[PDB]
Design a protein around this ligand. Structure first.
Ligand SMILES: *[C@@](O)(CO)[C@H](C[C@@H]1CCNC1=O)NC(=O)[C@H](CC(C)C)NC(=O)c1cc2c(OC)cccc2[nH]1
Ligand SMILES: *[C@@](O)(CO)[C@H](C[C@@H]1CCNC1=O)NC(=O)[C@H](CC(C)C)NC(=O)c1cc2c(OC)cccc2[nH]1
Lengths: 299, 298
């Protein structure tokens, strides 16, 4: 069992570099449009106190330097959708995959293709936290990197990167330019709401541990859904819904462990700690695997 | 800091499926050769005690079904090199990257592109353990999946998947078909040697902690390489080689902490534990980040 990402080839073929004067970041080239974070139009001074509509009307198409590898792409139009800039270019991307733009729900997972200067660098799996941050690995020049899922040859783009919070977690938008969470694309220190643990994902991960032979945390107790949620909320875990219980069905069916029985194990874990033992080699309870992630990897 | 796979697109364009009879696995299509595990030519029953030489003499070019997607690549030549089959096909792969075949050392990390029926399924980072297994994630149909590194748009292929041990770890070959470790490609339960901790990678991780301002564990002592190697073995840690000392060079230079000073700090952690303290947010010492991974990810 590993943290596994989608193969990144279909997205790699779409990454380009976008530059305005001194400011450079990544864009996503689909058909004849390049999508990128709108703050590419900002100078350093602009970023402190931007008026985006004001700065954009003053830009000309020839101010935008778009590079796909060695080839420059001529910008022939531009518009702004929330925090995303849409650059019309004179060439269609011949490797545009079947794709969709989706806004994901907290607790869902996606793969991140970290890019720098339009060049793909690494791929890794992230979850949208309940407080709408993501725990990513992003350096200077990573803005415009995207997150995505792949479902039978179709790429669902869900995340475009904009920001690293003082706490080292990250914040960004969907491909409609709308931030996840209460953040803004301005050069200021911003805090997120208090984070919580994604309970349904922890449970999926415990089932993964059982599937892979580690059972030490199981017990003979059970619990009602409500009494589990009482303890979970006490430890800053998200509540578990009956929808979540149903989504855990296949993993319950596979292991022969009723969902509310695994809840009783998790309750004991939260109240007792792991006593220095590990689960799937982790000293901490892991909450960035969805039930579908576990089902896909373990079957 | 977290584990990152390489972007997999250059390798995805090289994945094909190879079928003999009803037996299908994955192959790697570079120029006009497809590389794949030789046990594709086994029936379910021959895998118990296979005579690959005798099994291959019954085989002809036209018995091999090679497909890129649903498109057949006609096989025009075949040969066996150790545990891989090399199938020459009539079409040179137009997406062949710059590539090399390399045999990695224990401790080295690489990205694995897990594939099923020639269809890439996922990508993740792996380290070769000192006992020559990898802690992978593989299901039925995964054989022929490859592991690789990318250095300046050149793909270094280092692993082709063959086997899952009873303990749930994985074993395979380099792309010349030579197993890492004492494993053989037959349908038998095989055991790996007892595993050890990858000392050079733990040290790289301590340097990354230092680079990030987490340096409480730096002590006032130094050690000789030989003294350290002897104590490290008492804790089931790998001994350091001269090559290990040299690849820690850049990180030592960046932090101003001599390699042997860091070894003395690690030795104190081994003899005394962490005393409830963490390093880079972990109570456990991480050993699957190489010095290159620390440089790359910073
Ligand atoms: C993009 O590369 C920018 O084009 C960059 C990515 C981050 C740099 C380091 N790691 C990253 O993920 N983004 C930024 O620099 C953004 C730009 C905004 C949206 C205009 N800003 C921040 O991430 C940012 C600003 C501040 C800050 O101010 C003052 C104070 C504290 C944190 C902080 N983060
Ligand atoms: C390839 O897919 C096979 O072409 C398959 C991959 C493993 C299946 C489950 N997870 C995997 O990684 N490989 C095998 O089935 C190989 C085939 C050999 C090389 C001919 N065999 C094993 O991995 C294997 C056999 C046995 C065994 O016997 C009896 C007993 C215990 C473990 C075991 N593993």
């Amino acid at each position: 069992f590993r943290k596994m990402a989608f193969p990144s080839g279909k997205v790699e073929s779409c990454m380009v570099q976008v530059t305005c004067g001194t400011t450079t970041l990544n864009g996503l080239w689909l058909d004849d449009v390049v999508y990128c974070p709108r703050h590419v139009i900002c100078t350093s001074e602009d970023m402190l106190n931007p008026n985006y509509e004001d700065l954009l009307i003053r830009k000309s198409n020839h101010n935008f330097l778009v590079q796909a590898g060695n080839v420059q792409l001529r910008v022939i139009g531009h518009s702004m959708q929330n925090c995303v800039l849409k650059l019309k270019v004179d060439t269609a991307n011949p490797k545009t995959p079947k794709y969709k733009f989706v806004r994901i729900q907290p607790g869902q997972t996606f793969s991140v293709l970290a890019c720098y200067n339009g060049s793909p660098s690494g791929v890794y799996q992230c979850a949208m936290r309940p407080n709408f941050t993501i725990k990513g690995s992003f350096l200077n020049g990573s803005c415009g990197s995207v997150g995505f899922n792949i479902d039978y040859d179709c790429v669902s783009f869900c995340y475009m990167h904009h920001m690293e919070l003082p706490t080292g977690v990250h914040a960004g938008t969907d491909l409609e330019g709308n931030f996840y969470g209460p953040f803004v694309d301005r050069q200021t220190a911003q805090a997120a709401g208090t984070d919580t643990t994604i309970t349904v994902n922890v449970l999926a991960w415990l089932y993964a541990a059982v599937i892979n032979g580690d059972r030490w945390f199981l017990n003979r107790f059970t619990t009602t859904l409500n009494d589990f949620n009482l303890v979970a909320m006490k430890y800053n875990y998200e509540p578990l819904t009956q929808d979540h219980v149903d989504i855990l069905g296949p993993l319950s069916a596979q292991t022969g462990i009723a969902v509310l029985d695994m809840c009783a194990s998790l309750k004991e874990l939260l109240q007792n700690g792991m006593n220095g033992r590990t689960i799937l080699g982790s000293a901490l309870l892991e909450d960035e695997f969805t039930p579908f992630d576990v089902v896909r990897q373990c079957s």
